[PDB]
């Protein structure tokens, strides 16, 4: 019954979402029992997942339940679920934080008019992310790549009455589709070749055609690259760096939703679930070393050049992912095993913490700035404020590394793995990695104690009502302590399990090119719109016109004057004899 | 094993028929404002 | 199993349409005659279910509701109906959408006596295309929906009505004659004068003779299923139409060209299909590329979806000309998916035009602020077209992609350049749909709100039709064996018959 945890937030999305489209006069009044409804089913979804996580490692490890999806003559498609430690751990990294966003957004959105629709999105968003982490096939990671990408379009375009989030939500879907375009070619390329869709089949079937020679290793070189086109177009790189700037053009817990538990649950999981595909081609590992190092450079070098904590923290998600492709780029995935689960444990604890900084400043946001969501304009969140600025201390410091805290074991083995794999290309990363710890400390100093402008102490729907830019004293949300009681101890409980190479969860769980193309495809669209039609509407201009002008041309054969009619009768008599003797 | 279309098409068909007969009664905007009027695309 | 089932299903809405001129109470607009069309529409679909859930008996090939009567023995034409696994999904689809096409025809009070006549005569005449196993009844039924669709366009339609309906009837009648030319060519080949579709399949035709008949059917079926050089009637006849006329044209009428490609070009003519298959998949690829670029370059919303219907048609044409049991099963699934998907979009385009009265899409913007439920249903149907998984637009396209580049019939450098080019429509479909989704509802800046679009609402009846269309859209997208179980008995025999001619 382990397939129930995908469908249980999905059942929460169909029950709630049908209530809006059919019962709008009642569901908009039942905003509070609806919000606690999916938060019950997600808490149910944890209650089946932690047992599937804790009581699977050091216990009954393997599980593969399959159900046939499509069928033909000697062509079967299967779709089911697996319970693997590489899969069961990946539940807890997302099923906890999906419970965390719906707790945090419950306190954020209180006067929001579209209140019930937001939790209906996260219901379907969480169910789509809980689907592909148990997925055994490349098809079932391509069932839920767009289903995650659809809610990522729906959550950015949540406030549909804002045109800044309108065009941001569409291009977030298209840039997710050009990675999905490669993943679709990545399936059918490796299904023409291997004939299987499971990685247990493709663990043997792939290399049997490479070392022998029925397919060239350069032919499969682009094919494993085409699968890798998925996670790089979903992270705003030098193909199209347009995705992650859209992460802070909508609601505030979307950075915790789509910029914290999507690139780690799709970009990091898929390159780890496909171990026997990348490991057997040395022409692929040199490209995930190339493209993996540059996105750590491209994410960091644009993040210092920023006047806001909105995009620069989202640019930190690009650059910290640049030290996750090197978790597979060097082969030693155990250095990425610690930052597999901790990229949403105390990293998202800042991503929920930084959202509460710009939320308890002025009140509701007009479009961009009216809730004071900009840096270099206000300061003083550590002088006199609530506990929401105290998770800005421990949730920011331990990433560079503190020897008592966790995260010190995160950034030592990722250089310790490249010291044993490829120490000739280490200097290009350490010139960044020594500086990505520097400017992330500037995120602490320029957002907690700085040049103040006004009294930004409250009004994140946490103080009393009618507090537009009027917040003298502080007010802690009731949905802030239970965030700080769960994932804080889990940032220490997972900081001892899977931290070193020999630990608990280490062995038991072992730029404008799109805009140059969207303006490029729009050029050939207007030219092709009247090209092939007008060569057949020229036939309409020929044939539909020469039929009428023949009938207007043969009309003048009838001209009256029946003496002429006696000619054509008698010329036919003269003409049909010479037709019949010849 | 395979879920067959016949026991679920036969189940949903009287659900389908008596709902179109009901949902014809519940309607708005095609009887009160109706600036399209007698037409359908004018 | 002795009652005439398909003969009743064909001839009930034709006969019941004759009581439409005799319906009493003409209280201004036609209210009881609107209910009478839904009466004999719904109970006609109930017979399609009752003949399916009792006397279909699937996982066997051949016809299963067979009734071969005698009409004119002097010619040799018989009233021969019969439903196999190629006919029966589209026969079930025709009864399903036309029950909703009557239910979406409820603002039609212009000439309601004439309207629900020609819509019920197009209900019996559309089922009659997939059901008949004959030639001169097939050409009869193909041209049976010729006048009851001219008059549907030319009366209830936008501006440029009469240009659209006249261009339609000349392309349709002017290419239906090639069904008569080719259907008579096959029945007089050799010594047997049989006009049955099953007897004409087993006849042995020469390869030079078959290439004439294949070119005869391809101009006949490239018009109705719009193969892209013969497609120009489609955005005119769909650019000036209403929403109930749309779901019969996009949902049903385009599928008769795709259905007859599997009957009279693959079963009857396999040896010419081996020679004219690579031209189809290039034509199917440039069907997807051209229509998606032309959809993005268009401002009319009703013509934007009209060109979008040409793109999803291209995945049928790739899947037929691939010689795979999964390629053919993705070709028939693309007919049933787009029939439900294109009916749902075109109903909502007619629902948005009934409020905004513009169809210009530069004169709109911010409509979704006023009406919320039509916007909620417009995205759920637009995302259906995007081949988004969890819905039947994906699995129909997924079987075509997989079923093409696993076939032992083409070369590897030809299979790479097709699946690369046919997957550009994976990128190109969120280009025009989501922008049209953006340039209509997503907006603070609204319209003039004075001349047109003074009202805004969302009826519960209009929600129900989209809700009924999304149950098979999602339900096949979550389990495509709910519809493949009808195919595989017959498409297993269609490809295996075409497998014998493949070493060429």
UniProtKB/Swiss-Prot annotation, chain C:
The keyword Nucleotidyltransferase does not apply. It is an enzyme of class 7 (translocase). NDH-1 shuttles electrons from NAD(P)H, via FMN and iron-sulfur (Fe-S) centers, to quinones in the respiratory chain. The immediate electron acceptor for the enzyme in this species is believed to be plastoquinone. Couples the redox reaction to proton translocation (for every two electrons transferred, four hydrogen ions are translocated across the cytoplasmic membrane), and thus conserves the redox energy in a proton gradient. HAMAP family: NDH1_NuoM (MF_00491). PANTHER family: NAD(P)H-QUINONE OXIDOREDUCTASE CHAIN 4, CHLOROPLASTIC, NADH-UBIQUINONE OXIDOREDUCTASE CHAIN 4. Belongs to the complex I subunit 4 family. This is NAD(P)H-quinone oxidoreductase chain 4 1. It comes from Thermosynechococcus vestitus (strain NIES-2133 / IAM M-273 / BP-1). The gene is ndhD1.
């Amino acid at each position: 019954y382990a397939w129930l945890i995908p469908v249980l937030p999905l059942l929460g999305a169909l029950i709630v979402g049908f209530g809006l489209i059919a019962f709008s006069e009642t569901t908009s009044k039942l905003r509070r029992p609806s919000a606690i409804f999916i938060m019950a089913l997600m808490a149910i979804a944890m209650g089946h997942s932690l047992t599937l996580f804790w009581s699977q490692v050091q216990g009954h490890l393997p599980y593969t339940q399959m159900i046939e999806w499509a069928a033909a003559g000697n062509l079967h498609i299967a779709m089911g679920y697996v319970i693997d430690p590489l899969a069961a751990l990946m539940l807890v990294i997302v099923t906890t934080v999906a419970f965390l966003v719906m707790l945090y957004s419950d306190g954020y959105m209180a006067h929001d008019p579209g209140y019930v629709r937001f939790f209906a999105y996260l219901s379907l968003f969480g169910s789509s992310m809980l689907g592909l982490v148990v997925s055994p096939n490349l098809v079932q990671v391509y069932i839920f790549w767009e289903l995650v990408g659809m809610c990522s379009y729906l959550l950015i375009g949540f406030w549909y009455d804002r045109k800044s989030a309108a065009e941001a939500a569409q291009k977030a879907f298209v840039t997710n589709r050009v990675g999905d375009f490669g993943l679709l070619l990545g399936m059918v390329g490796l299904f023409w070749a291997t004939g299987t869709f499971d990685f247990a089949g493709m663990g043997d079937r792939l290399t049997e055609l490479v070392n022998t020679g029925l397919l060239s290793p350069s032919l499969a070189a682009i094919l494993a690259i085409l699968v890798f086109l998925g996670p790089v177009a979903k992270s705003a790189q030098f193909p199209l760096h347009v995705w992650l700037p859209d992460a802070m053009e909508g609601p505030t817990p979307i950075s915790a939703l789509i910029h914290a538990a999507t690139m780690v649950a799709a970009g990091v999981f898929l390159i780890a679930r496909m171990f026997p595909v990348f490991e057997q081609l040395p022409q692929v590992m040199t490209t995930i070393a190339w493209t993996g190092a540059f996105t750590a450079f491209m994410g960091a070098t644009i993040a210092i050049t920023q006047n806001d904590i909105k995009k620069s923290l989202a640019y930190s998600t690009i650059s910290q992912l640049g030290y996750m492709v090197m978790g597979m780029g060097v082969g030693a995935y155990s250095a990425g095993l610690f930052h597999l689960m901790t990229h949403a444990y105390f990293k998202a604890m800042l991503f929920l913490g930084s959202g509460s900084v710009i939320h308890s400043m002025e009140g509701v946001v007009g479009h961009n700035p009216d809730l004071a969501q900009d840096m270099r304009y206000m300061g003083g969140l550590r002088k006199y404020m609530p506990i929401t600025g105290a998770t800005f201390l421990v949730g920011c410091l331990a990433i560079s590394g503190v020897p008592p805290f966790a995260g010190f074991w995160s950034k030592d083995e990722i250089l310790g793995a490249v010291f044993h794999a490829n120490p000739a290309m280490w200097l290009l990363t350490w010139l960044t990695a020594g500086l990505t710890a520097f400017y992330m400390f500037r995120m602490y100093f320029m957002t907690f104690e700085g040049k103040f402008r006004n009294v930004p102490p409250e009004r994140q729907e946490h103080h009393d009502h009618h507090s537009h830019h009027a917040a003298v004293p502080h007010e802690s949300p009731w949905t802030m302590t239970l965030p700080l009681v769960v994932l804080a101890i889990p940032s220490t409980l997972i900081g001892f399990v899977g931290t070193p190479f020999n630990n608990l969860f280490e062995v038991f769980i072992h730029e404008l090119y799109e805009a140059v193309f969207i303006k490029g495809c729009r050029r050939l669209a207007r030219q092709v719109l009247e090209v092939d039609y007008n060569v057949v509407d020229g036939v309409v201009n020929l044939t539909g016109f020469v039929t009428m002008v023949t009938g207007e041309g043969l009309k003048y054969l009838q001209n009256g004057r029946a003496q002429f009619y006696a000619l054509i009768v008698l010329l036919a008599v003269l003409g049909f004899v010479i037709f019949s003797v010849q | 094993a395979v879920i067959s279309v016949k026991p679920i098409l036969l189940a949903m068909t009287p659900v389908f028929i008596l709902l179109c007969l009901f949902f014809g009664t519940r309607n708005g905007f095609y009887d009160t404002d109706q600036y399209h009027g007698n037409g359908s695309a004018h | 199993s002795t009652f005439p089932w398909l003969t009743t299903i064909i001839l009930f809405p034709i006969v019941a349409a004759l009581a439409i001129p005799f319906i009493p109470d003409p209280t201004g607009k036609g209210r009881p005659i609107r209910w009478y069309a839904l009466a004999v529409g719904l109970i006609d679909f109930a017979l399609i279910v009752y003949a399916f859930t009792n006397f279909y008996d699937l996982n066997t090939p051949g016809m299963q509701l067979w009734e071969s009567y005698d009409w004119i023995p002097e010619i040799g034409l018989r009233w021969s109906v019969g439903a196999d696994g190629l006919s029966m999904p589209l026969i079930l689809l025709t009864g399903f959408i036309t029950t909703l096409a009557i239910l979406a025809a409820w603002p039609v009070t212009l000439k309601p006596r004439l309207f629900y006549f020609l819509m019920l005569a197009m209900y019996g005449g559309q089922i009659a295309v997939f059901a008949v196993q004959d030639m001169l009844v097939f050409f009869l039924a193909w041209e049976l929906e010729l006048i009851p669709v001219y008059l549907l366009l030319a009366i209830w339609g936008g501006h440029k009505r009469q240009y659209a309906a006249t261009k339609f009837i000349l392309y349709t009648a002017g290419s239906s004659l090639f069904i008569l030319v080719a259907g008579l060519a096959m029945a007089f080949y050799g010594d047997t004068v049989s006009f049955d579709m099953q007897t004409l399949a087993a006849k042995d035709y020469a390869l030079g003779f078959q290439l004439l008949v294949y070119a005869g059917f391809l101009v006949a079926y490239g018009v109705k299923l719009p193969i892209v050089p013969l497609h120009t009637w489609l955005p005119d006849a769909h650019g000036e139409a209403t929403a109930p006329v749309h779901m019969l044209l996009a949902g049903i009428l385009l599928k008769m060209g795709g259905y007859a490609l599997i009957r009279m070009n693959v079963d009857m003519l396999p040896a010419a299909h081996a020679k004219f298959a690579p031209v189809l998949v290039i034509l199917g690829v440039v069907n997807i590329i051209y229509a998606a670029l032309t959809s993005y370059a268009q401002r009319n919303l009703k013509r934007k979806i009209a060109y979008s219907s040409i793109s999803h048609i291209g995945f049928v044409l790739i899947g037929i000309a691939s010689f795979t049991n999964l390629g053919m099963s993705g070709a028939v699934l693309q007919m049933v998916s787009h029939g439900l998907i294109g009916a749902s979009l075109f109903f909502l385009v007619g629902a948005t035009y009934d409020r905004t009265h513009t169809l210009i899409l530069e004169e709109m913007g911010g409509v979704g602020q006023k009406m919320k439920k039509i916007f909620a249903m417009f995205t759920a149907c637009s995302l259906a077209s995007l081949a988004l998984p969890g819905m039947s637009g994906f699995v129909a396209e997924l079987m075509v992609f997989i079923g093409f580049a696993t076939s032992d019939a083409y070369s590897l450098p030809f299979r790479v350049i097709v699946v690369f080019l046919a997957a550009v429509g994976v990128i190109l479909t969120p280009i025009y749909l989501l922008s049209m989704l953006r340039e209509i509802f997503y907006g603070p800046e609204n319209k003039e709100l004075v001349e047109h679009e003074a009202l805004v609402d969302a009826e519960p009846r209009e929600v129900f039709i989209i809700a009924c269309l999304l149950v098979p859209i999602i339900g096949i997208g979550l389990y495509p064996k709910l519809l493949t179980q009808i195919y595989d008995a017959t498409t297993g025999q269609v490809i295996a018959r075409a497998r014998e001619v493949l070493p060429t």
